[PDB]
Amino acid sequence: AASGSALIFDEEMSRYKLLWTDPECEIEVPERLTVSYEALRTHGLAQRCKAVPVRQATEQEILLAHSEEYLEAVKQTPGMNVEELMAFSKKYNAVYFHQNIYHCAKLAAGATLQLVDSVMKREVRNGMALVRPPGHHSQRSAANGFCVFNNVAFAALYAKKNYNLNRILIVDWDVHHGQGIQYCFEEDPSVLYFSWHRYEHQSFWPNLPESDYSSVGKGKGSGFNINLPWNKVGMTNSDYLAAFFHVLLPVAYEFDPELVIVSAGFDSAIGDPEGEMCALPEIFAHLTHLLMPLAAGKMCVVLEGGYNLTSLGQSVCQTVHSLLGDPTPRISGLGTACDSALESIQNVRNVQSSYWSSFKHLAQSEDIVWPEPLKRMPASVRTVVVPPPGVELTLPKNCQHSISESTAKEVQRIRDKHFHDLTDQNILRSLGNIISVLDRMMRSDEVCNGCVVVSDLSVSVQCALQHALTEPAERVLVVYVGDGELPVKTNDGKVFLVQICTKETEDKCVNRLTLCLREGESLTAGFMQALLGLILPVAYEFNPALVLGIVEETRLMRVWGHMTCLIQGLARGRMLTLLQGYDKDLLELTVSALSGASISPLGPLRAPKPEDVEMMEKQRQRLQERWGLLRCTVSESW
Ligand SMILES: O=C(NO)c1ccc(Cn2ccc3ccc(C(=O)NO)cc32)cc1
Ligand SMILES: [K+]
Ligand SMILES: [K+]
Ligand SMILES: [Zn+2]
């Protein structure tokens, strides 16, 4: 199993710059690279990454995406003086050339291919390339928008040719539309391209009609190009997460890519002079995290744009933190996307509904300042495991088995006050472990999450929940797989209960989400539908301080690892899972996902039952006025 994160960088890519006056071009500067690397070094992140060297892309590699005529033309720019470079630059839009830019372009491209090789060879889990010049605007025969050669396009074409991959996802979260990537894979269903971008009704550069939501691809590629235009500036964390939960992720997990490549422009971050969006650097920690369960974690992040040197360094750090598996920061203040984003989201979902299952829409009808991000630190041990007495297991290197007298006195207090007749000395053991791991998770910063196997469900849950609330945990998200009633009160706003059950039951609290999924071959696709489109939107808005997972002993959850992995985007990754009864496999799967191991892909699934989609949309209707992040349409105004 692959481990580690590659960081691919070279100061040579900082050795070209703009050589004449041009206020529009002067934003793209060498310091973008140096500020990004130095931020990674300052925070100790570069030192934790494998420093794979850059190389030049070969001529044959450049020819995968560009014409001989265009390559030959750019190959002559090293020999040009400044007058000649300016004249060559004016043949293209929004791009400048320099004696060294052809050299650097070949390095930016080779760097990306090195990243692809390291990930696909399993030499690292994932990685990031800090490159100049950017790539995603460059085309078959044109430089465009500071881009010379299309780095991310090369990476997908190279991965197809040399690793015979059938499905590649490209996620372009730069604030500009990567039209060069769109054109490259327009007719290609093997490479799914997603882009959000500032558009403003085509008035924002590059001002293309085909950057709109209606470009879904051509021919066999129809449905494999997804454009999400932002028609207002000021988009927030909530808008970006709505885009992921209600557009990108449902398609990504159904597509089931074999490799994820990210066109990572951070000009979509707050403070950027080109993007003028309002999302915080912390959001990129979660954008990265939400994609990591795809392709067994094989993710290649490639730097595109980003022009506020402060915003840029912080967003690069948040991304690498997540690649290294550090705990995600808590996102507060989430709610509904704005109306213009909901309109863009509504429109993309509708035009894409002929290609993607979950999008169908009827029933039978169809100076800027922001706070510095907090420090993100991996816990001493990530995952504590407490299997039944007398069960020793092989644990991953960042897990550990679990009982002091302070703790022992507390279990005594709890028994005498709340369970008078309880004397099962094994239950009293679990209760001592529950309190002990929670104390390490919450107050100690030494442990991140934990799994405890339990026998008595009610006393275990009550002790876990009540003890967590006084840690203090202002809010606790409970995720319960099983039927029956739990000793959990959801009446004061401190607890949200997600219940995956088998019996259909009436929901009356807006602090509860009950999912009765019809048993069948389709339970997997429906659960993933609910996870990305219902559970995660509410969980992120709730913003809990702790997640409490509970699984009763009463087989069909080939979904648990994805849930465990994605739900660690909440509560800085602080999740306590209580498994009722010993299941060797479920315990090993739970520990593996809790500890940050890569997740096995889901592959293909029978599309969800209409009864399930109906049940889920009734939940969204019932909950979205309280929990606006659930909205994937514009509200109907009175
Ligand atoms: O790559 C980017 N971000 O990551 C990126 C790409 C393009 C631009 C805008 N831009 C930059 C020089 C320039 C010149 C003319 C025009 C023009 O023709 N305007 O109408 C536009 C221009 C900004 C950033
Ligand atoms: K984009
Ligand atoms: K495509
Ligand atoms: Zn950009």
Residue numbers in the entry: 1 to 366, 399 to 434, 437 to 588, 593 to 676
Lines quoted from the article behind this entry:
Histone deacetylases (HDACs) regulate the acetylation state of lysine residues of histones as well as other protein substrates, and therefore play a pivotal role in many cellular processes. We report the synthesis and evaluation of a class of selective multitarget agents for the inhibition of HDAC6, HDAC8, and HDAC10.
The hydroxamate of the major conformer (67 % occupancy) coordinates to zinc through the N−O− group (O−Zn2+ separation=2.1 Å). Thus, inner sphere Zn2+ coordination is achieved solely by the hydroxamate N−O−group (O−Zn2+ separation=2.4 Å).
